[PDB]
Design a protein around this ligand. Structure first.
Ligand SMILES: *C(=O)CCCCCCCCCCCCCCC
Lengths: 210, 158, 152, 141
């Protein structure tokens, strides 16, 4: 499977991005989990039971979807959870969703990471990072002669990624050869690009998981 | 079987009790010495058992009782008395591991206080601030030996 | 108790008490590592009673075969002696010095980690009706030799 | 082929640095390379954590460029064993754990005269390490 796609500027700016893809338990006072506020979100700092894991954020209380660090009711989540008269309470946790800005940051972070990997290379004539691996995902990167990066995240077993990258390059090429003087720091909004990229993803989704 | 460690520990205690006029101080040095052992021992433990970082005081208690105590003391303590918050539990031992044979016997001295330093020192090296404390000792009339384990906070990456 | 527990414990013991001496002597002069050796002696005294002879030699064969195997999981590498009560027990790979070095890098401190073991041998000899003086010597880690002198 | 090896603390302190086959040297002082290497490594840990669509167990395992492959192992105590090799070398996690277990723990942690949180000075550790790495089947070029 394919998790997501990132198209980065030569300057580290995100000009295109696409994603290709929840526990609820009743608690008494006090809670079995340690919660902390992190970047306008309430996450689980410690404790792991019945589906809930450390990095999970509070998504809803008593069936009510939470609003960042506040309650659907306007009250501060951690304050509400600090009052024993509000128990029992039903809470829903899940891997938080990346914000647009977070995506911008990560894309910029990867930009410098890529360069360093090249700079700190023990062998000459080395490119930046082409493949970064994890236990849950693999990141594949292709850099154009003009410095544009096509980043694809997928299941560690997913194959036929070389063709996907090569295909995205073609699709991008059509957008470049059609928009010769288009701003480099501006996002790729062309519907043909989006649509063609979509299809390449469908194809790749069938290259098997070997 | 290790009477060496137990006998050696007995000599340490004996010595310190002579060095210090007040037992409260012996408890302090034993815990500190334990701590110095714990921050080192954690490495030996991880390299031999291959356990990963924990994220729940309950899994941490299992590793401690069923894997660590077994490996270094040839025993498997019992886990009991979980506080509702889950940030507190106890280690119940049939007897007292650091003890060999002692003379009998009102003393403020916590004979096996070294253990506590080991537990807090080791756990600290894995991002967990905990207080280890003796609340029941077979050396003092109690039925069993009980160590209370309290989670204070998770240390953050620098 | 696993081997590392004693190893680490011992380490904290020399660290904390290698310079300690409450019973100095003429002019306040402290006996080098006297306390550590003192503890080794008491520990050795008990091992002498709890481990499984005709002449003196048998007593020393025991330290090299039983005591060493019980404390360091290995028999003494070599046993020498001038037939005058002075013995030389040598270990070419002494456990407490193994992690440290294979040369001279830590000689300055090496001695501090032998006091206890000398006491171990002396305490073992005592229990078996033998008064003596056990000294330790390291030229280059980890090869150290323990000297046992039985006064006449 | 095995290019070089880095050992890091839970605070970025460069515990140890060894080098065998490095044809391209950073254009900077090693004191700086260590900070750069760590910063990058630390960013990867953070990056990987937010990018992953699922909760992880091991986290970052390694990356590869056009010419080399970086192997990364991290213990629950913050110790990091980082090794660079040719693209040919597979996982080798057992090797990284060996460096930590059989060499660092054994000749650094078990050496009271070896301060933690600082560049290792033990000649033994250094000898044993070098000897061990030169043994690895994929050491030569
Ligand atoms: C999860 O984060 C892993 C937890 C690892 C805990 C390790 C604790 C080791 C401490 C040693 C306890 C044994 C007693 C030794 C007798 C002196």
């Amino acid at each position: 499977a394919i998790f997501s796609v990132y198209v980065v500027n030569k300057a580290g700016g995100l000009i295109y991005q696409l994603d290709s893809y929840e526990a609820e338990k009743t608690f008494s006072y006090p809670l079995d989990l340690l919660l902390k506020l992190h970047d306008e979100r309430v996450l689980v700092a410690f404790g792991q039971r019945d589906g809930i894991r450390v990095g999970h954020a509070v998504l809803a209380i008593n069936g009510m979807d939470v609003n960042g660090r506040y309650t659907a009711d306007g009250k501060e989540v951690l304050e509400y959870l600090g009052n024993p008269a509000n128990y029992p309470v039903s809470i829903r946790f899940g891997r938080p969703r990346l914000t647009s800005n977070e995506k911008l940051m990560l894309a910029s972070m990867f930009h410098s990471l890529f360069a360093i990997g090249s700079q700190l290379s023990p062998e000459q004539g080395s490119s930046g990072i082409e493949m970064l691996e994890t236990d849950t995902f693999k990141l594949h990167c292709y850099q154009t002669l003009t410095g544009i990066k096509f980043v694809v995240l997928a299941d560690p077993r997913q194959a036929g990624i070389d063709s996907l990258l090569r295909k995205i390059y073609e699709i991008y090429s059509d957008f470049a050869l059609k928009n010769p003087f288009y701003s480099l720091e501006m996002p790729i909004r062309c519907e043909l690009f989006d649509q063609n990229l979509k299809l390449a993803l469908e194809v790749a989704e069938k290259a098997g998981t070997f | 079987s290790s009477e060496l460690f137990t006998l050696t520990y007995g000599a340490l205690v004996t010595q310190l009790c002579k060095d210090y006029e007040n037992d409260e101080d012996v408890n302090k040095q034993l815990d500190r010495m334990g701590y110095n052992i714990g921050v080192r021992l954690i490495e030996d433990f991880l390299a031999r058992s291959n356990v990963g970082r924990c994220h729940d005081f309950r899994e941490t208690a299992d590793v401690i009782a069923k894997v660590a105590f077994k490996m270094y003391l040839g025993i498997t303590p019992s886990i009991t008395n979980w506080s509702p918050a889950g940030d507190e539990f106890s280690l119940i031992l049939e007897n007292n591991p650091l003890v060999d044979f002692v003379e009998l016997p009102h003393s403020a001295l916590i004979y096996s206080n070294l253990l506590c330093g080991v537990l807090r020192g080791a756990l600290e090296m894995v991002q967990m601030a905990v207080e280890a404390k003796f609340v029941q000792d077979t050396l003092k009339g109690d039925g069993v030996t009980e160590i209370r384990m309290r989670f204070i906070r998770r240390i953050e990456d620098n | 108790a696993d081997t590392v527990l004693f190893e680490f414990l011992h380490t904290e013991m020399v660290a904390e008490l290698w310079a300690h001496d409450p019973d100095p002597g003429p002019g306040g002069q402290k006996m080098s590592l006297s306390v550590l050796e003192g503890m080794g002696f008491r520990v050795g005294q008990a091992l002498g009673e709890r481990l499984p002879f005709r002449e003196e030699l048998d007593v020393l064969k025991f330290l090299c075969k039983d005591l060493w195997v019980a404390v360091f999981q290995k028999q003494m590498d070599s046993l020498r002696t001038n037939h005058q009560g002075t013995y030389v027990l040598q270990d070419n790979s002494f456990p407490l010095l193994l992690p440290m070095a294979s040369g001279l890098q830590y000689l300055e401190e090496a001695p501090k980690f032998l006091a206890f073991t000398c006491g171990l041998l002396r305490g073992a000899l005592y229990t078996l009706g033998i008064e003596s003086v056990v000294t330790a010597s390291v030229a280059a880690l980890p090869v150290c030799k323990f000297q046992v002198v039985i006064p006449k | 082929t095995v290019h070089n090896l880095y050992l890091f603390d839970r605070n970025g302190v460069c515990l140890h640095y060894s080098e065998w086959h490095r044809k391209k040297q950073a254009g900077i002082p090693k004191e700086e390379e260590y900070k750069l290497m760590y910063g990058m490594l630390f960013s990867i840990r953070s990056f990987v954590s937010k990018m992953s669509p699922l909760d992880m167990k091991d986290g970052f395992l390694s990356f590869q460029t056009s010419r080399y492959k970086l192997h990364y192992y991290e213990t629950p105590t913050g110790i990091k064993v980082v090794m660079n090799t040719d693209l040919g070398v597979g996982p080798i996690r057992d090797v990284l754990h060996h460096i930590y277990s059989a060499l660092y723990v054994e000749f650094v942690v078990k050496n009271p005269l070896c301060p933690l949180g600082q560049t290792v000075q033990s000649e033994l550790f250094r000898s044993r390490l070098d000897s061990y790495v030169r043994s690895l089947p994929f050491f030569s070029a």
